[model samples]
Target: GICRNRVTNNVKDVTKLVANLPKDYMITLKYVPGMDVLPSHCWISEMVVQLSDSLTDLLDKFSNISEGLSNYSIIDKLVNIVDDLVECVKENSSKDLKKSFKSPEPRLFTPEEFFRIFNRSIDAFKDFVVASETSDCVVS
Candidate 1:
């Protein structure tokens, strides 16, 4: 009970700090809980950590795709980014079979570059979209 109380209070303390930070200051704030308190950290912490991880993964993929599609138009590049992610979703499912992003080409990766091949795919798809758009636009 006491450990849980500590967790609850810590969260409220963090919450108040977030709410009270001077809006005009606008600096990123990161909180690192002490070792003793982190294990019992509340549900909020778990969800936030996962959310932060997913966004980090997403933005890294976005960055890689952007690099690969450097000369491409914006909206079509974005539309195909969604398609490539969907392709991953569709390809990875089973009762026995399993699939995941191949290890990044660097023979290693940061969580940021967790799946670099998707970035390569983004460029190919963007080129396809650009080609289709240019051919199909019959300005009357």
Candidate 2:
């Protein structure tokens, strides 16, 4: 189906993970759109796959810790960014554009937008590690 890859198709709720850690945790989300062609637009497909994996990696990173819950905000932000990417791809990919020899109008997101979001997600994760105070190790 068209735009099938735009999002996970299976929506999820991360709230349950909060039960095991100390309180004061939060979360956020972005989105996605869906696609085709062998043009540079193809990058969107590859990007979505990698972006989605980023979320999984973060969750796994703190899986063993009892207070890994602080990483919640980071995950929240990642979720929304990925979600936004998914939505963007889906909506834009469906548009029928002229196949001219020249490149079409610039993409909605440049490398900067992509990296900014990527870096921020990383920052969110790192910030959580340094900011949150757990009962066992209280590092401010």
Candidate 3:
């Protein structure tokens, strides 16, 4: 099936997913890496992991005043970095897919095709940070 495991923690679960599916299954799961996507090789899987890690650490820092507002820029940077990674994957996919793909059925993916996932990850961080910014406090 050429399953791409970009830091997948549940290979067995995915194997189960494949095994449990109907024999007549025609479902295809593709990231911007596309229908013929490989996990890494031009994908932002590592940046995604590290970006998430940074967002987590930044979020853990307490924000209580204008000083805390500085953290907003980190979120902005993370979002942009995630976007850059997405664009990078889109731009570089042609070469990687040719090199890494075992199948011939190219799905013609674009930045939007996978940006949702990238956006979702960053959005989770944005939501948390925004909440912190808006949290009820005297701000003395």
Candidate 4:
């Protein structure tokens, strides 16, 4: 429950932080396609796995672009919080969900496109958090 609250609050925090990010700052990274698809028959643990995988992919991309940047800390912090939430959820759920397989060569995105994708991921995460709270079904 604490992990759920942390994720909920952090998602709110990151939404505002990302919204206020410098709109003109462009960065590029290899992005695996179709990393945001949720299963039709979703379980709590499954949703957490998808969120974790997507954020991990985003974090990997950001890491490459952040090498020479001076103001990369915000993005770093955002990803780290989500990462923490993922680990916490996995531990509590007692299920070892698989990370999605990424392609060796993937497409790159511009700042605008990347931020949009990032926002979508966060939205999905928010949905997952809400679902976990409302659903009584145990993690499977």
Candidate 5:
């Protein structure tokens, strides 16, 4: 089983990598609704589901623009980590709940907006990791 701590650590590693990347590099992103929304009262399981959906959506967009970028290797590694994180959530979540996870329709987003959304996801997942430690809420 993938420990929750490992999941959080992996995401943090990806975050650091993304932070060092040239922000000027632009890519078209398929925006998912509420991808970055984390309410204070939201359940841990809900957070996990949302994060998984959002990251999966990100990977789809990354694949589309990956070959054209000069920093493809770095972006590829980052995409792999994001995919791993998505898998971690699925691995730890209930089968039924995993089935229930659905991503909304995609809209177009600028590179800056996409990065901001990605950062929000990192924040939500970190919060989920902390809360899941003590919370009894399990994925539905």
Candidate 6:
């Protein structure tokens, strides 16, 4: 049996894959999350999805402030989020957030894929936050 913890929903695990990797690439990660192995990952994506929703809420509060969301601040928060997530996954603990994941085989999508989706998600939220500001528009 594999990590049957199946990320019960589409929870996100984002890794940035830029050609020029972040300076702190070796952020001294002590361990990685380990999930239960399931025959089928019917719940993995679902778990992450819910986790994403919660993340949105967490981020929303931060973005709503007058200071608002800035790329720099968001990057810092994002790092903490990812680190916290990895630790949570490693311990298989779903304390406050009722989320779990079980990934048996190698993930199908890569960091690049998640980065694309992450950018899209951020763009979509930013669009909502600054809908009236034309300058913030991205020329899709």
Candidate 3 Cα outliers beyond 4 Å, as residue runs: 1-45, 67-69, 90-92, 95-140
Please provide, for model 3 over 1-140, each residue's C-alpha lDDT reduced to its tens digit, 9 standing for 90 to 100: 11221322323332333343344533222333331232333223433544444344444443524453343444445445554444434444343221323322323223233333445433332232122233232222
Q: What lDDT score goes with residue 140 in model 1? A: 27
Model 2 segments more than 4 A misplaced: 1-40, 63-69, 94-140
Which residue pairs does candidate 1 place in steric collision?
none
Which segments of candidate 6 are over 4 A away from where they belong?
1-16, 20-77, 80-107, 129-140
The list of candidate 1 runs beyond 4 A from truth reads 1-42, 64-140
Q: Per-residue lDDT for 1-140 in model 1, tens only?
A: 21121122113322333343333422221222221222211112222332233334433332334443231223233334344344433443322111211211112233223222223322222232122223221222
The 10-residue segment of model 3 with minimum total lDDT is: 1-10
Models 1 onward score TM values of: 0.18, 0.33, 0.26, 0.44, 0.48, 0.24
Q: Which tens-of-lDDT digit does each residue in 60-109 have in candidate 2?
A: 65634445445555465556657655555454534322122232232333
* lDDT (Cα atoms) of all candidates against the true structure: 0.28, 0.39, 0.36, 0.46, 0.45, 0.34
Better of 2 and 4 by TM-score: 4
lDDT of 6 by residue, 3-68 (tens): 323212222323322332344332111111332222112232333343344334444333434354
RMSD of each: 22.2, 18.0, 20.9, 7.7, 7.2, 16.8
Worst 10 residues of 6 by lDDT: 27-36
lDDT, residue 85, model 3: 43
Better-scoring candidate (lDDT), 1 or 5: 5
Ranking by lDDT: 4, 5, 2, 3, 6, 1
Of the two candidates 2 and 5, the one with more favorable lDDT, higher being better, is 5
Identify the candidate with maximal lDDT.
Answer: 4
lDDT tens digits, residue span 1-140, model 4: 43445454344545454565556645443443334454312333333344445445555444344454323455566566556655755545433222334332434454456656555544454454343334333344
Candidate 2: RMSD to truth = 18.0
